[model samples]
Target: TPAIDLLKKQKIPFILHTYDHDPGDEAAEKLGIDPNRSFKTLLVAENGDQKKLACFVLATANMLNLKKAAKSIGVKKVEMADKDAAQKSTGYLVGGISPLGQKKRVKTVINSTALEFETIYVSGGKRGLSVEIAPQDLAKVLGAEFTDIVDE
Candidate 1:
């Protein structure tokens, strides 16, 4: 996996978890992942410009508030990136986009809440897989910032 390979190359620590991912049923409970500690990586575009892409990670239970995300980056607007655009740029499928080791690194922001946990779970560049790592380490590896990007 690109995600795992990158972590290894960077010498960042991570734990990999795998489960049978089924729609309408989140993998957290089956895999001992706390809902609060499980984050989903989302691809968004600045002002709907495909070329102006960004990534955001927030707890699976929370929704990314476009207004807040835009404000966090001092942008006028942001919208979910088209699936084709996302997969193409990240070199990962929609369900497997990790902030690290993306084909093209763009803006990435993690929700402030991730700091509350000792380690957070994010997609390991594929479905049915997740990687656990310390919030600080994850940020450092991805050059991502932690901020308010989700709705209360």
Candidate 2:
């Protein structure tokens, strides 16, 4: 609901979807969506700075390469933040983290591959819920940069 509220407040158009969230399966696989069209929200922090965190959005089919992620943000190195930190910062559980509407505003980056799809799916602030939104709209809402931040 928080995610939807933020989208509505920002006047960003999006479609909501619900599915049976299976912990054993990835969001894309469980939702029957193309992996390339499903974006995963990741919480990352500079190697030694916990407070300096950022959100990284990438296709479910790809992996976040820490080296590239750090370089993209002009940091020396970065690592995935702990579950507690992620939850605290984003106010959402790990599998249900949405890049939009976080408790704290953090730099966010979306993988360039997402541009290939007109619309992509991201967690709608909870498990079993997803938001279908245009990549540009998402970028505008999150003020995220599109860059090459994933591995092959």
Candidate 3:
């Protein structure tokens, strides 16, 4: 996995997790962790344009509020990335897009709440897999900014 490769190159310490991964949205529940400890990587395109993509990481249990996301990154507006757009840009399918190592450079925003955990879970660049790392380390590796990008 590109994510695994990146982590190795950076020498970042992390734990790996895996599950059946039936392709539903219950990753937190499936991983047997508090919902907020598992994060999901989502893509937002500027004004719905695929070419201008940004990645947002938020708790799996929370819904992203697109407008709020835009404000955090200073984009005028955004829409969920189209399925094909997401695949083409991230080099991974929708269910397993990790912010760790994207084939293309993408602006990344992580939920502020992630810092509450000593470590958090995110996809490991593939389905049915996850990588655990300190939230600050995750942000450090990706050069990600932190903010409240989730809906109330």
Candidate 4:
């Protein structure tokens, strides 16, 4: 899988998890994990060029504040990419988006709340699969910065 290969290539330690998945189901809930420790990868683009996109990786229970996300990246405004647009940009299905590996390496911002956990889970490039990893390790892998990007 894309995520597994990337993590291995980088020598980043991670645990692989496989569970049942359902259409339109939340991964955390389906896997019986704490929502706070499960993250979702959201693709957002600046108002103009589609290539100028960023990844917002946040807790599953939280919401991305568009205004805050734009400000975090020094952009005037940003909007969530459409499903097709997001899938095209990340090269992962909507429910299986992983911040680890993408078609294009866009700027990434992980929610600060994730720092509270020693290990958090993120999509493993496919539905019903998750990778348990350290927040700092994930940041290092993606060259991401952690900040308050969620709307609470």
Find the candidate with the highest lDDT and give its number: 3
TM-score of each: 0.94, 0.93, 0.94, 0.94
What's the lDDT for candidate 1? 0.88
Q: Which residues of candidate 4, in runs, are more than 4 Å off? A: 23-25
Model 2's alpha-carbon lDDT is 0.87
For every model shown, the clashing-pair count is 0, 0, 0, 0
- Residue lDDT tens for model 4, 88-149: 88789978899988887899999998899999999999988999999999999988999899
Sort every candidate by lDDT, greatest first.
3, 1, 4, 2
TM-score: model 4 vs. ground truth:
0.94
Per residue, candidate 1 scores C-alpha lDDT tens digits across 11-81 of 99999999987751265776877798889898899999988899998988999999999988789999899
Question: How well is each residue in 30-145 modelled by candidate 2, as lDDT tens digits?
Answer: 77888789988998988757788999999877899999999888899998898888888888887788888888889999999889998999989888989999999999988889
**Distance from true location, Cα of 38 in model 2, Å:** 0.5
The local lDDT score (0 to 100) that residue 144 gets in candidate 1 is: 86
RMSD of 4: 1.4
